[model samples]
Target: MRGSHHHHHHGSVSFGAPSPLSSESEDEINYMTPPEQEAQPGALAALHAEGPLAGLPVTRSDARVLIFNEWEERKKSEPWLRLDMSDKAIFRRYPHLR
Candidate 1:
């Protein structure tokens, strides 16, 4: 009766319960599903790389936010920094910066 013991295998029932290993091969290290976690730093790096925000003015809103924030931060430490354009022109371009 040793082989007649409690050994049972259900096909449909077993398959219903998912094996987490089947779909978790990615990132194995503190991974987050949804992306854009690096949106801030991502845009920040490309937007304001090094030695000030050196580039033409951006038309994208997110780009604008990054640029203005960079300028604002720079203004704090480097008080002598001046806008390439007139204050009125800056106001015209980024009125929302106020």
Candidate 2:
């Protein structure tokens, strides 16, 4: 604890569940676990139902659906920020603003 508060950082990779040290926090802290595919049944089923055979020769419909889904997702996340690309006079007049 630092000044009656706590900070935590988990190692990005884990061999097993983290064990507490004697000097360590008893309060809640960051921890890590391996990514488990079999644990998420809903996600697995959704993937198969939508486009699991997308790349297979017999799955053109699945491939089209997959492409359209990806395009729609990309459209939703399109960048909103714009850059001042031109070398305009206002930029030179206010060096700090630019």
Candidate 3:
């Protein structure tokens, strides 16, 4: 009888993990999008070229939160900043701001 060479192989096993945010909607999880200005090439890089916030950790998650909170507070203080839909629609119809 020749020497025996037995190579044992086991199939892969996986466990089903529960969803991270069971209560949150898909929209909340997928809310991240590049800023509108970032549509232009190198715009994001340009933003970090200089300034206090640039190259800082503040550019992380809290930046959006701080910006939106400040914008909401400003809107409350100055309601006129909120343009009318009619005016906005006209601007959209004819891109005059450029």
Candidate 4:
């Protein structure tokens, strides 16, 4: 009986020129903030500091009331502080409210 001969077979796979791959994005995300109105860090206190209430030292609960009370009025005058007056921003200042 002749010993079985084994052949190692190899095949060249058709690759797209070794693929130095490439890619792009055309997706437009419209969400953007008003960078012009951005304020300094810790500006939260600044709002109440010279805010509608004149930074009157009030309890946290009352602070929300004051901020909400003045939000509409202040947003019209100082649009920049609109962020600070937002409920979202208020949560940052007063975590308990969130």
Query: Residue 26 deviation, candidate 1, in Å?
Result: 67
TM-score of candidate 4 to 2 decimals:
0.27
The candidate maximizing lDDT is 4
TM-score of each: 0.26, 0.23, 0.25, 0.27
> TM-score of the candidate numbered 1?
0.26
lDDT: the better of candidates 1 and 4: 4
lDDT of 3 by residue, 1-98 (tens): 67776677777988898657566566566747744752323212112335644532233233333334445688899876653324354344324221
lDDT on C-alpha atoms for all candidate structures: 0.54, 0.42, 0.44, 0.55
- Candidate 1, residues 6-96, lDDT tens digits: the string is 6667655345666555655565766566665335443432333444445434345444555567777999999987754445665665554
What order do you get sorting by TM-score, best first?
4, 1, 3, 2
What's model 4's lDDT at 19?
53
Candidate 4 structure quality by residue, lDDT tens digits, 1-98: 66776668776877566656455353465446545742433223223456555654345546555665577578788787753455676566665446
lDDT of 2: 0.42
On a 0 to 1 TM-score scale, where does candidate 2 land against the true structure? 0.23
In model 3, which runs have C-alpha deviations exceeding 4 angstroms?
Answer: 1-51, 54-57, 82-98
Better of 3 and 4 by TM-score: 4
